[PDB]
């Protein structure tokens, strides 16, 4: 871990990735895949299996599977500081539904009705249900305050 911490640090520090571009690579590839609760393949996927799989394949970032657990990763983000690659969370029978912000008030998610899609945050259903956001892509800091 004392090599692997340096190596992990070095990777975060050199890698300047185009976050939106990478998310849309994944979306192009996964567009229209069906809803299956607990699924995580191209035969069917739920919202948080989609997030988990996206951040791993595209950013090498290890997120938990549970949406409860995904809602406590990284720092919370107010709505006006929203950036591409932030997890957007909604009160939506789960209680809790997660997508990825991709700018222009759009987000990418696995929905019940349509499978993997882009929606607008402004769509009445989601604006009522918008709950919070989390930043999980985040250059990790040298010294920490208490």
């Amino acid at each position: 871990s004392s090599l692997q911490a340096s190596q992990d640090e070095f990777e975060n520090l050199v890698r300047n990735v185009d976050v939106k571009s990478r998310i849309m690579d994944q979306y192009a590839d996964w567009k229209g895949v069906r809803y299956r609760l607990g699924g995580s393949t191209k035969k069917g996927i739920d919202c948080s299996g989609f997030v988990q799989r996206t951040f791993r394949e595209q950013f090498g970032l290890e997120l938990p599977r549970s949406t409860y657990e995904q809602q406590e990763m990284g720092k919370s983000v107010s709505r006006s500081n929203l950036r591409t690659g932030d997890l957007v969370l909604f009160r939506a029978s789960t209680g809790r539904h997660v997508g990825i912000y991709i700018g222009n008030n759009q987000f990418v998610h696995a929905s019940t009705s349509s499978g993997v899609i882009i929606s607008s945050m402004n769509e009445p259903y989601w604006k009522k249900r918008y709950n919070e956001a989390r930043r999980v892509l985040s250059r990790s800091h040298h010294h920490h305050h208490h």
Partner: protein, 262 residues
């Protein structure tokens, strides 16, 4: 000296490995402008964490000359103009951050502080209240806001901070610095609360960097320069170079220094 002290932090082996390697890579000619600017930015950050601010600023400046769209560069340039006492050039640098990236939240803080030190307390409050409501449970957001509201009126700056404290979830350890400033707890009590929370030496050094700055400001507000000069020095002696508390402890000492002449 019968008091609470850490081993002043030393460069970590990781920092030196990464600097040693960066130097090898930057010496190569197998780098795009884009990947070079990136190494320069990230070496700048590293140099800044070791307190080598002239070298960091030098790398940042070179990163920007290659990739202009770097709000993170302008943020650091702003910070360094603040530490230099060039508040006017600093306001302008943070202006730039938020033109480039309106979401670059931390420049509200950093320009808040630059305005504070520049004697622009009303404008500072504008930025530090903005910062505060982006994360209420960050105690340092409320602490900087208190500092800026303080000069306008001490009395309702404390009633506001009390408000922030009660409104917060009160987890993070820094709410103790707040509790002291309210007069909830003694300075004695703050120092044992501190040691309790602090695990290893690095943790201890972070706790003492942040805390001795806020105690320094408390004593300075009372007109005790002797006590404040000491608490600013013990803050810096932790060598947590990239803390705002560390940087501005240095500025206060510079201001205290220049008062003391003639």
């Amino acid at each position: 000296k019968s008091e609470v002290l850490a081993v002043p932090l030393q460069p970590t082996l990781q920092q030196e490995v990464i600097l040693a390697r960066m130097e090898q890579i930057l010496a190569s000619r197998a780098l795009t402008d884009d990947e070079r600017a990136q190494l320069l930015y990230e070496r700048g950050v590293l140099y800044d964490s070791l307190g080598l601010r002239a070298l960091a600023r030098n790398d940042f400046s070179q990163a920007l000359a290659i990739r202009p769209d770097m709000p993170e560069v302008f943020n650091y340039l702003g910070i360094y103009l603040t530490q230099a006492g060039n508040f006017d050039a600093a306001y302008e640098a943070f202006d730039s951050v938020l033109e480039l990236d309106p979401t670059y939240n931390y420049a509200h803080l950093n320009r808040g502080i630059a305005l504070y030190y520049g004697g622009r307390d009303k404008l500072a409050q504008d930025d530090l209240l903005a910062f505060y409501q982006d994360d209420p449970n960050d105690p340092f957001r409320s602490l900087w806001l208190y500092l800026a509201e303080q000069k306008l009126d001490e009395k309702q700056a404390k009633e506001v901070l009390k408000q922030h404290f009660e409104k917060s979830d009160k987890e993070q350890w820094g709410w103790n610095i707040v509790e002291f400033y309210l007069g909830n707890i003694s300075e004695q009590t703050l120092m044992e609360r501190l040691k309790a929370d602090a695990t290893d030496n690095t943790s201890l050094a972070e706790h003492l960097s942040e805390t001795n700055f806020y105690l320094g400001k408390y004593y300075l507000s009372l007109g005790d320069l002797d006590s404040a000069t000491a608490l600013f020095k013990l803050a810096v002696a932790n060598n947590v170079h990239n803390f705002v508390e560390h940087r501005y402890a240095l500025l206060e000492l510079s201001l205290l220094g220049q008062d003391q002449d003639d």
